[PDB]
């Protein structure tokens with residue numbers, strides 16, 4: 001329902017902003033923080049988040 | 053003399069075309085397929101004036117009379133044998149037709165017979181009729197056996213027979229056995245060839261589709277597609293419509309997707325209760341799933357037959373290429389040009405350029421026939437045309453009944469909690485078929501194969517309901533919540549972990565199918581008003 | 589080759605067979621086009 | 636097609652000939 | 667979702683500022699290089715999955731060949747059947763073909779997701795990476811399946827090669843289900859090149875490989891006395907001599923085999939085969955004339 005982009009415009013930019021925030025956070029922490037366990041700061045489903 | 057001459061040349065044909073590796077393998081196994089003894093019939097076949105009791109007897113003419121009758125009887129038997137068997141036997145038919153072709157060729161070295169195509173068209177009843185016996189038996193078997201009894205496997209690209217209780221059997225008039233000379237030539241050859249084609253009886257796939265394509269031609273395919281469309285129109289607007297209308301009422305008026313917090317076990321319990329009447333509906337599989345599988349198998353047949361046709365056309369065009377001036381790209385060494393050598397190679401194959409040569413040396417009648425022939429050879433469907441889109445577009449027009457889409461949404465946008473669109477009923481049906489069954493029970497995929505899901509997904513796509521289905525589906529929601537909480541309980545005898553594993557499998561399948569349908573089905577949108585002040 | 593073409597390109601083969609069945613330097617061009625479609629020729633052009 | 640089958644089963648079969656006589660003698664050694 | 671990565675390359679220019687133009691082109695070139703690499707790798711993986719499916723289907727096609735029926739013939743003259751693999755009991759049982767099929771469809775969704783993308787004013791077309799790799803791979807597999815070895819004088823039976831080529835084509839045709847590509851034109855491109863003595867890249871073809879083998883292996887052993895033409899069988903056949911032949915001549919020269927060869931070589935290829943046959947007759951003729959003059 002592409003018409004919803006009218007009334008729900010804010011949610012689009014909210015969603016983009018929130019997801020963007022999480023990606024840049026993960027990026028810097030994966031690169032800079034020692035792991036407690038092997039799966040720490042590894043998100044195998046990150047592509048799904050970027051795709052949407 | 054005529055009897056043994058025909059039998060001799062049939063056995064020769066059967067031997068010539070018998071796989072050499074199989075021959076040697078049988079020899080090593082101590083079961084040598086014994087090669088027929090050679091004979092000397094030619095001098096008898098060359099006798100045009102036997103002088104007997106003052107008469108001049110044309111022995112050649114007399115032999116031909118009988119040999120021609122034997123050829124026709126062979127062809128009648130081959131087609132009649134097909135008519136007494138299921139669709140998988142068409143491969144066997146094709147082999148037998150090829151042996152008959154070889155027989156005619158061997159006999160034509162000494163005798164004058166009607167053209168093989170003429171003989172075949174007559175036996176096929178395709179001289180004074182537009183569709184032959186082979187084409188008509190194919191549709192007969194599609195309608196009575198293939199559509200109702202076969203299960204598509206999308207990973208192997210093969211169809212197989214359904215489970216016993218769904219196997220719709222019908223009595224076949226098994227043909228009386230004629231003499232070996234009218235089949236493959238001898239008992240040994242008959243046994244050898246029936247073993248060879250035994251492999252092809254347990255499935256329907258690319259080889260069967262390849263054969264069907266050749267034997268039906270463009271006209272046979274067209275009529276079968278047109279008739280499959282009529283079967284689908286009849287099923288969708290008839291019994292399926294009837295059961296959809298029935299089940300839409302039995303369906304819960306409203307069904308909300310419960311929030312994550314309730315947990316996956318509780319959500320499973322919720323769906324069980326809410327969809328109990330769809331679950332317990334006695335004829336859901338025997339009638340509803342059955343009729344949908346038939347729709348799916350019909351639409352699959354069209355897709356797969358188009359693909360076989362495309363493979364057939366491309367191969368034809370490759371062999372046409374040298375007589376049609378068409379050359380592949382050539383390798384260019386340093387100091388050479390692409391245009392320089394391509395023109396030079398065009399010179400080499402100029403004596404093979406058919407139409408120009410006939411235009412140079414042929415009669416106005418020859419030229420006109422060649423020009424028409426050339427146009428028929430180069431212009432194939434694979435060149436720039438496709439069919440599956442047209443098939444789908446036309447099935448959409450069979451869904452004009454108001455209960456496919458339901459009433460206008462309360463919110464002016466879309467239905468959410470309401471169960472008034474087909475996709476919602478499909479979601480209830482999906483709930484049923486995702487439920488795990490006992491270890492010794494047959495599953496939906498064992499009984500109906502992929503065709504069921506092709507049909508259900510096709511309806512959703514053609515109604516433009518696939519996005520709302522993706523969002524609102526019950527099973528997808530359960531899977532989503534279970535992924536989050538990772539809980540595993542046996543709710544109403546349904547082990548949740550096993551249930552959500554199956555949901556994922558059908559989700560994968562649905563997404564592939566929906567994506568394919570959307571791809572082949574290759575503007576202004578509904579806009580909404582911003583709030584308005586009382587001022588104006 | 590002949591049997592494969594007659595099955596793949598019958599409309600072209602038909603025209604070729606007619607054209608062959610109906611000079612001595614000009615007749616070689618008919619034969620080269622014929623032998624390319626697997627038609628047996630009295631005189632072999634490639635030879 | 637249904638009527639087309641009936642016009643081949645019922646419409647099917649609707650002699651001191653040497654060939655005929657020889658055929659019958661051979662046809663027994665198979666059926 | 668792999669198409670997200672090349673799409674992200676379009677963002678790279680947003681990081682630049684008018685006060686540091688020194689870095690702009692470096693970042694630009696980085697976005698192009700990465701986009702190209704992502705799309706190439708996505709195409710290579712689809713290519714790899716397709717090859718694996720082809721191999722699986724060639725095996726299924728092989729299982730249909732007459733040679734496998736010998737046991738059935740022999741046991742009938744004394745006193746795992748195709749299709750069983752397709753009989754699915756439960757979708758939770760995951761076959762190799764299931765895995766390959768799913769992985770292929772998932773990735774083709776990404777390759778077909780967008781017709782093209784614009785990265786730093788350059789236009790990238792994902793499907794064209796797939797088309798190109800399929801052409802090259804199909805060529806590669808055809809020559810591979812010919813199983814040609816100079817040293818041992820071995821080559822595939824034409825009928826078996828043709829069977830495998832057909833299975834490949836069936837799988838490749840199915841790609842049109844997933845991606846807006848014309849597979850017919852890749853068939854054209856690859857197969858018509860195979861009819862020539864060398865392809866567009868100057869490499870040997872099935873035509874040149876078979877032409878060489880029939881002359882240098884089969885017909886040479888006829889001269890050596892180990893094989894004879896059998897008009898009765900319409901084939902060349904191994905003679906019962908004291909020899910060390912590694913092949914059965916009838917399995918390369920009978921009607922079905924020669925028909926299979928013609929399917930693959932076509933008029934171009936068969937014409938080339940004959941020209942090579944004629945060269946060897948020329949040499950024999952030149953030698954005969956010498957004996958006539960003598």
Ligand SMILES: [Cl-]
Nearest residue numbers: 039040041042
């Ligand atoms: Cl993490």
Ligand SMILES: [Cl-]
Nearest residue numbers: 104105106107
């Ligand atoms: Cl007399």
Ligand SMILES: [Cl-]
Nearest residue numbers: 133144145148
């Ligand atoms: Cl049969």
